Design a protein around this ligand. Structure first.
Ligand code: PLP
Ligand code: PLP
Lengths: 755, 755, 189, 189
């Protein structure tokens, strides 16, 4: 038990107050309470801004000057952001406190202690009971149950065989490994223990309680806890939603696990094509692609769906937000899509936090409270380890029940289908805690901080870009709205000059309006998508606002390599874009290290520092290519290549018309099983059918899926692979990653169904 | 760093040796080495029989008396059981040690230190160097890489969002959680870090190195580390092996994950029927059920496979060992089954340790050294968390490549289909450590200890049974051979009287020989199956050797409940059988607690203690049923029920002939997706196609799989459910579990396909 | 939690036995268990004839001499006169103990620890478990229930007015009175 | 690892700044970092004029008075004369530091810590990480490699015969000589 005691600076002159507080702190030590003593409200505010966990706040209070009243409000306000239920003791004057007694006081203060008129032991006893009560309600229901149960549980005569870790201790390596992870991970790793705890696969007991909690917090009718990631989540939903008799509508921006659902169900796919901009960033699917008549036509025209014309699609999937933080107006999206399908699945894997900050209002599935069952059935999936706080593999299926709803009995057969009979309860616990953190005041507080940090980073870089540009020198710039408007005044600000409170709280600062050139999504309708403040792309010069390469530029590839030599690995990297991921796990000011490294890159680029000094692992690993070359020399050679080969346009061509779907993904998968596939060299790809998906980076969405034909000898899909290969060949050490290829002696191969 | 120094008691009279060793110990302390000082070989033996991890052993050695020579061999032999590579320093006499110089001496001793002729610092220095060498080779490849890499890794700008656990610390619940688990779990929870570690899904870098190590240790051509249990391992293998064009042969004793594979692939199944015994325990599939013409016939006559007569099945699976510890002679099983199928899948989920003890020789898939590809392709699956040492969800697919082998490019598409793109590296790390523990001497030592403990518990029980029997009183008895043979003599023993070294090392003692009535598997051929010593079933009295209930009996359900009140949970409980799982995690002598609790049961049973005293929770909850009864009263009532209802006969009838397969399990699963299913009450079950599998406990194997008909009015399956249901109604608190049922107001229901 | 460990004098010549028991006593102390060490059966007898309440008896046992077999019977018999359900640990030799295995041995011994073949921590953990189970069953049902309920009970807005003794503390006489009788009297009232 | 922390005399009135810096000091100690605490720029200037090697400099900064701006330029300029790549942490005010953000600020400051809004452990971890990176680039190529290699090196079976100095210790005169010059001279031979 930790108590924070703030002595008000407005009473230091009344020394007897200090004496009385010391007597109380003494009484608290005697009962084994850890006592933190603060001598000003400001010291207290700062302690409460740290991650210091306390069980009780006590404070003294003169109650005369207006500045103190405010200090009190601020203090208890700060406490209650992330420590919402902590009990507050006023160590006050009876007369003054009772004169001031009203709803506002009681909102602030939970317990009253007349410091100059009571016994220290009495107050301390009351403080211990309050702290006990607080601690008893602190932990979420699954984590709490697992913990309690493991204190009584007999680890013998059942699996797991290690028996709360004892197995590992039996060899030195096992023992070292055991002590490195500590016992509690092993103690809470118990097998199915029902009447005690319940079952994950049955959704009973404390596992059930945890799922109900999750639903209340995330605004779903029902939530399913998953230990196989959003991979297992997506496989589950799709198993439950479609058979090989069904037509389905699939976002071309879909995860591998969406394709896996196709392969596992045998369903008949039609694809919604997303936009893109000059940076190779994938934008939203436009409203036009979601119109019921657009969908009807795709179905009628497609070789996979023709013979099922006019059949109602059983499932529809959209990825929201995208990898680069394009967030759809899901409320608008639902309206169009539900005119086609009764089952809507928004794959929100990177986006579980959205509900808990007003800035995302309307741009996610679980808006407001659930309960209105008139409308379609909606699934949202979260990888809670992505941008909530949880262990890898932790995941949720969130469900709003509507038309075409699927009851527990039916859906749980799909759940079990993709589950394990022996789940690791450490994962489930982290999933339970993930929810706790978003519950009440803290959900807002945690999300606001990520937004705040990302914005400070964004403004800093806008400011620096502006500064450098006035000296006729180049710099990186953030990818976000350039000119912003305060909606109360009518006042306009460039991004750098904007009040940060406007940027961090007003949605309109992020909305992609038509006519704004920054987003680069040509003819996007208004009020359709926004940019997530926390997905911060940074743009190296080289791409012009018209969508053509400039006379000079700085290739991100070289910047990403420089960054890496400092541990820093951006999540994504195009030709000029570099995306940095801000989360609830980031600490304040940490972005300052990004700036420092981008500045040091700039200083070396301009000095043209020999690669032997700045990138020695590159130079000694490829002596011939990079000897006698500086960093600017390499930027230059890399930019020449971009100019000569126009990969951006190659890209766009490869993504404009979908390749012809010859067979379904399942059918194409089955070719593998039938040993009826072979590795085809790049130059032989035209006319061959992909045995697996092909996902180039960039744009990091599928170019082909399994079962699609590469096309004729004029194939843009094959030619885009040609350019990636060429870049790889010309700049060793800077190779692209393409999912679904095999490189043989530097030559690209894809697995294809036999002739 | 830890040194054990054993001062030979044959030199205590030479007090200068003591002085010289103490000068060494001091010098070691100055180099920050922890020194454990032992003053006899016996003390040293004891220390080395604990889980104490030492980095160096040093000992003095008079080298005159045969007893000391023996003590030395015993000491070093003991060290090297579980601490095989620990350096051994002889603190010796130069002249005597060098006169003794031969290969036997150099096998015992790594380093020679002339303790009365050297400087203590020089010896300390060489000891520190040796200990460093030992510690640098100690850890398996992946755990080591993860550990090293987390020390330098940048947790920012990368998912997972918590960044080495930092995110959790920001709310008080989340901090409690973080600190309960400790930071290292979170610090090794990194996302794909490609050039540093490699990838699980790509099988590269440290991950691939770990799999090659696992394959070497486990005798495979190749291993696949899995983070989704054997559930996921199984789905992978089947996904790789079959389409809806294939016939497949399936052990009717199959895990839910096998059915899942059938439902995911759409393949056409035919079943091999396992034997069974008077106790309700499932036995092995007899060789006749695996004969080429037997299977060819099964196919010919099956509704699901009729029109695919004379197709080679593309896969065949057998569960080995069974839940209760029945192990197949996999050598002979393979010989038969390879005549039908080129792919053999042995599901060894409960059986990962078998290769590392001679007692199991020939009764597991990965026998001797891999290399010969003139044979079938064989898969073995291990749930490494089950009876190896590993966190839940950790699993391996071990493969021997033969005819019909699936290469890497093909198999890995099946791998990913069932994977997650975000694996918890904690799980992987424990899978790497499970391998380490089984590598070399320690594999033998660990598995031998489990066998030794289980045999001690068995022998104690056999003795007690014999003693109580001789006294005209009843007792529990172990389910194992009655009479045993020393094959080196021909001498004969009661299990109870047999030398334990015979029972713990000689396989013939566990073999189920034709005619032997202990096992109960009528007309089983010789050299076909054995019992695993470590799966200990205890048998309560009541079932006669002729397979008919006796005149009295103690129902096991009563015993299981009494064990609950002491926090002992058997993994399996039938009518008269109680199974206790022994593993590498159990500590020595722990079985004694089982004997104490079973004894106290007997004591209360014979005294007919009021249920109010000994089962108060039960009396509290159903006061009307268990009012004014003793424990013996209730056992009598339960036994009367068994006599009247004869559940064993119903079990046997329900398992004699397979239910008719109307549709494949996939086709049936699809009926759920179409909303074409309903909850059907017990009496309306005849005529109905089951939409999910039904697994009653006992015998704990599917009575029906998805798509099978319950049968006509006479249906034995339905009558079996009836008596399960009847038991429950008669004995509230002792309810059976049945997977795939729903119980509504006490009436069993099963989801079936609509008529 | 309190353990009495009795080292058989029939084994003082085997110094490694005392070494292994020392590591066990150390491991128990690390778990906040009070350890009483006794170096002979007679000493153990005398301790057990005092009003000394213990939660576990551990003893070593050569199992060779009839005089020792008798000492063991006498020691555990004494334990169980007034401390009937105190769990008993044989810190034993595996082979000799398992050879002697029968109903008489089991009335003497609840738990087996192969003192020369096991990790001290493992044995210590099993003793703590057994001692916890012992203490949970120790107290008769009303006293036990009063004790438990007082630890979670709200002494306010309820008679008696003294409220777990607080009322008495308000004058020096009442306060002297309160401290003299102690809080538990007032708290169970 | 040695950190110098300069507490600007311009903030001594804001006593809460001092409290927060103390929490950071203690967090740094707990990570076994040596903390030199300086309570004025002038004291800071002097320490940096001595031959004191530090792996990180942290300072507070009110950012109002022209005298302080100069103090900061002078302290950091001094640091970087002879300790050029020492990481500098500003223990600063977010609003003010970020209103002042520009190339000039970035030449002075490598790392930003909002001292009144952050956890002491998060800042200490970031400091340790920066000091680790500094030490790894600190030494020149050959002395670095010699130093590293001598640690893993087998002195035996080749020349010099002294084998990292052990030879010298075998007579009293040689051992005197050996301990006089210390072992590293011989180990790098
Ligand atoms: C990562 C991701 C998934 C898969 O989640 P895992 O938790 O990695 O299995 C599914 N959909 C999207 C959009 C993702 O980004
Ligand atoms: C438990 C088990 C499985 C499934 O393994 P999990 O690790 O629980 O996914 C598969 N087959 C058998 C025989 C099993 O016992």
């Amino acid at each position: 038990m930790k108590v924070l005691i703030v002595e008000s600076e407005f009473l230091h002159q009344d020394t007897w107050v200090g004496n009385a507080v010391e007597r109380l702190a003494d009484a608290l030590s005697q009962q084994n309470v850890t006592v933190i003593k603060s001598t000003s409200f400001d010291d207290g505010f700062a302690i409460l801004s740290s991650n210091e966990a306390i069980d009780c706040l006590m404070f003294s209070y003169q109650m005369e000057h207006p500045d103190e009243h405010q200090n009190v409000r601020q203090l208890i306000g700060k406490l209650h952001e992330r420590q919402q239920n902590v009990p507050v003791f006023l160590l006050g004057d009876r007369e003054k406190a009772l004169a001031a007694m009203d709803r506002d006081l009681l909102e602030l203060v939970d317990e009253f202690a007349w410091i100059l008129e009571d016994t220290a032991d009495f107050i301390a006893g009351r403080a211990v009971a309050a702290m006990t009560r607080y601690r008893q309600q602190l932990l979420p229901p699954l984590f709490s149950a697992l913990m309690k149960y493991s204190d009584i549980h007999e680890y013998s005569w059942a699996a797991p065989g290690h028996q709360g870790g004892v197995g590992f201790t039996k060899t030195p390596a096992g023992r070292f490994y055991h002590d490195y992870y500590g016992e509690n991970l092993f103690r809470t790793d118990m097998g199915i223990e029902r009447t005690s705890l319940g079952s994950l696969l049955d959704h009973t007991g404390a596992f059930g309680e945890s799922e109900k909690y999750a639903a209340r917090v995330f605004g779903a009718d029902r939530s399913w806890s998953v230990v196989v990631g959003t991979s297992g989540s997506n496989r589950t939903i799709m198993q439950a939603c479609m058979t090989d008799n069904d037509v389905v509508v699939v976002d071309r921006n879909c995860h591998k696990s969406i394709e896996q659902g196709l392969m596992l169900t045998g369903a008949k796919p039609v694809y919604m094509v997303p936009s893109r901009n000059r940076y190779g960033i994938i934008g939203p699917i436009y409203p036009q692609e979601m119109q019921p008549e657009t969908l009807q036509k795709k179905i009628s025209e497609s070789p996979l769906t023709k013979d099922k014309a006019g059949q109602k699609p059983s499932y529809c999937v959209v990825t929201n937000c995208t990898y680069d933080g394009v967030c759809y107006n899901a409320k608008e999206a639902q309206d169009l899509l539900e005119k086609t399908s009764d089952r809507l699945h928004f794959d929100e894997a990177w986006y579980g936090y959205a509900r808990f900050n007003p800035i995302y209002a309307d741009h996610y599935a679980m808006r407001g409270e659930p309960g209105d069952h008139n409308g379609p059935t909606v699934f949202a999936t979260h990888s809670t380890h992505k941008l909530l706080n949880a262990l890898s593999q932790a995941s949720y299926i969130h469900v709003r029940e509507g038309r075409g709803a699927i009851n527990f009995s039916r859906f749980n057969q799909a759940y079990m289908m993709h589950a394990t009979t022996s789940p690791l309860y450490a994962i489930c616990a982290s999933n339970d805690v993930a929810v706790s953190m978003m519950d009440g005041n803290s959900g807002l507080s945690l999300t606001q901080e990520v937004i705040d940090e990302a914005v400070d980073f964004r403004q800093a870089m806008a400011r620096l870009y502006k500064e450098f540009t006035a000296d006729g020198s180049w710099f990186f710039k953030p990818w976000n709205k350039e000119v912003v408007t305060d909606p109360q005044t009518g006042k306009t600000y460039d991004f750098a000059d904007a009040p940060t409170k406007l940027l961090t709280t007003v949605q309109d600062c992020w909305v992609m309006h038509p006519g704004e050139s920054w987003h680069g999504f040509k003819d996007i309708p208004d009020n359709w998508s926004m940019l997530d403040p926390i997905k911060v792309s940074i743009l190296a010069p080289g791409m012009g606002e018209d969508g053509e390469l400039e006379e000079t530029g700085v290739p991100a590839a070289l910047v990403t390599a420089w960054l890496g030599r400092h541990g820093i690995v951006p999540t994504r990297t195009t030709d000029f874009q570099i995306m940095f991921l801000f989360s609830m796990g980031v600490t304040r000011g940490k972005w300052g290290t990004l700036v420092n490294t981008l500045c040091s890159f700039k200083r070396h680029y301009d000095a043209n520092t020999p690669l032997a000094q700045v990138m020695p692992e590159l130079v000694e690993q490829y002596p011939d290519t990079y000897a006698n070359m500086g960093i600017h020399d390499l930027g230059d050679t890399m930019f020449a290549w971009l100019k000569e080969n126009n990969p951006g346009a190659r890209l766009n061509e490869a993504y404009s018309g979908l390749p012809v779907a010859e067979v379904t993904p399942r059918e194409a998968y089955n070719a593998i099983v039938d040993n009826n596939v072979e590795l085809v060299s790049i130059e032989n790809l035209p006319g061959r059918i992909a045995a697996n998906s092909v996902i180039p980076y960039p744009p990091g969405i599928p170019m082909l899926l399994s079962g699609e034909n590469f096309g004729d000898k004029n194939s843009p899909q094959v030619s885009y692979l040609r350019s990636l290969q060429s870049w790889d060949h010309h700049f060793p050490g800077f190779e692209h990653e393409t999912e679904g290829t095999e490189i043989i002696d530097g030559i690209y191969h894809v697995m294809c169904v036999k002739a």
